Amino acid sequence: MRCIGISNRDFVEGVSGGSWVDIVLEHGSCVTTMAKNKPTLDFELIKTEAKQPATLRKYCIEAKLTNTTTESRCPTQGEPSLNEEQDKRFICKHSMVDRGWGNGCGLFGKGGIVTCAKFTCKKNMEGKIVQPENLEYTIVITPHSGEEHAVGNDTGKHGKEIKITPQSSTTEAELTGYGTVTMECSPRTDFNEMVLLQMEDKAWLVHRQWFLDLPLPWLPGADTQGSNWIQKETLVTFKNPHAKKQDVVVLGSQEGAMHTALTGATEIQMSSGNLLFHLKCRLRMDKLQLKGMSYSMCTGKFKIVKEIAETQHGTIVIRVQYEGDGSPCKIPFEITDLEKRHVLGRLITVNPIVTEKDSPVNIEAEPPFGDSYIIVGVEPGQLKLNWLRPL
Numbered sequence: 001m002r003c004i005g006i007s008n009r010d011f012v013e014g015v016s017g018g019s020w021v022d023i024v025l026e027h028g029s030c031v032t033t034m035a036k037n038k039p040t041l042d043f044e045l046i047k048t049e050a051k052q053p054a055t056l057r058k059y060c061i062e063a064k065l066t067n068t069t070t071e072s073r074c075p076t077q078g079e080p081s082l083n084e085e086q087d088k089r090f091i092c093k094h095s096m097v098d099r100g101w102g103n104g105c106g107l108f109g110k111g112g113i114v115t116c117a118k119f120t121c122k123k124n125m126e127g128k129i130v131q132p133e134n135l136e137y138t139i140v141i142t143p144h145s146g147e148e149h150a151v152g153n154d155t156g157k158h159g160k161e162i163k164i165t166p167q168s169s170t171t172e173a174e175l176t177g178y179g180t181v182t183m184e185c186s187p188r189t190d191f192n193e194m195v196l197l198q199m200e201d202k203a204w205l206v207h208r209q210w211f212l213d214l215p216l217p218w219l220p221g222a223d224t225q226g227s228n229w230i231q232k233e234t235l236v237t238f239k240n241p242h243a244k245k246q247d248v249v250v251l252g253s254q255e256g257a258m259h260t261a262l263t264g265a266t267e268i269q270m271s272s273g274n275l276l277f278h279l280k281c282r283l284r285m286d287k288l289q290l291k292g293m294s295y296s297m298c299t300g301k302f303k304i305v306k307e308i309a310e311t312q313h314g315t316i317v318i319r320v321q322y323e324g325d326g327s328p329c330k331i332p333f334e335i336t337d338l339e340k341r342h343v344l345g346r347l348i349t350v351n352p353i354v355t356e357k358d359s360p361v362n363i364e365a366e367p368p369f370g371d372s373y374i375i376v377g378v379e380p381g382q383l384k385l386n387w388l389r390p391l
């Protein structure tokens, strides 16, 4: 009954008798499944998750150069040196400047220079290794049991949670009162050669080869030191145009640059390892059964707890409380023409039943286009509601 309220919803009906039905579950999408003399079920894909992914490589996208230090030598005085050359946190370059009398040298010539600066990463991006094997799916199956709260109940408590693993693709969940439903799901979108690149609160799924060939400073997955970066040269530039001085320049944030490069790519919503992303399944309904197909018809009177409300798909919802005594019993329900002669429209919440008089029931039905009578219960106290469904 979760689907009631969700705009991206499909009403999949299986050719009655058939022991299977094919559905496509995805994020932000709900599915309602029906079959003759079988219970109506609601399916949602709650979460997609990677179980322990290996950090392939971490790249620096924004850097900072500090501690700029220069050692020079007069012509003929040798090559200059700093310890920073040994220190891996620094990026160094040797060059030549014009030396002579007016800048401290007894001789006139090309005096050797050396400049070192501290490479500090400010923003970086991990790309975690995904294998289709360690990819888990979380499906919620909610039967149409009229349960008082069930209507668009986001919490989940009402439905049976199920995990689809590529190691355990076939799962048989026992639905309390309806029997078992075997679910056979197939992973679709390759994930073998795919890196799940994580930026900030933004993340995507990208090619292994594309990732690995980025012109940026990087660190191997294994590294948790985070001090000295491979390829600093990709963000650092040394300038000496007039042999007067050597200038060290940062290449500017690559954050927005990256977002633009990632336009064509598969964007995914991410939060604490979970990717809220086209998972195609087969449903075995042979082992499913209607709760109450052998219960007798309610004879009592019914009260209207929640007024008829129309869903975005033309369907209607009614919440009613039983005031009789026969419970557990089948609630009588009918949609007829104004002249109460023709049976019209269909019932989504098939075989509506009362379990307890105290607990109200929610019924979803598809009214016909135009005027109809929604008749819930039996005479006396028979509820005769009127509906309009314009074209």
Ligand SMILES: *[C@@H]1O[C@H](CO[C@@H]2O[C@@H](C)[C@@H](O)[C@@H](O)[C@@H]2O)[C@@H](O[C@@H]2O[C@H](CO)[C@@H](O)[C@H](O)[C@H]2NC(C)=O)[C@H](O)[C@H]1NC(C)=O
Pocket: 147, 148, 149, 150, 151, 152, 153, 154, 155, 157, 158
């Ligand atoms: C969504 O569902 C929750 C709780 O789920 C149900 O709780 C029981 C009442 C019962 O129907 C279970 O089978 C379900 O799992 C709703 O919270 C309940 O609120 C009522 C008061 O309105 C209270 O009596 C219950 O104790 C609450 N349940 C719990 C466990 O706190 C919640 O209101 C529902 N929300 C919507 C918008 O439908």
Ligand SMILES: *[C@@H]1O[C@H](CO)[C@@H](O[C@@H]2O[C@H](CO)[C@@H](O)[C@H](O)[C@H]2NC(C)=O)[C@H](O)[C@H]1NC(C)=O
Pocket: 066, 067, 118
């Ligand atoms: C980068 O430069 C700063 C100085 O601007 C260095 O820090 C100083 O030296 C010691 C640590 O080596 C501190 O106790 C001082 O308090 C710092 N002084 C100031 C003014 O901040 C820093 O060590 C240099 N970086 C490296 C890695 O050597």
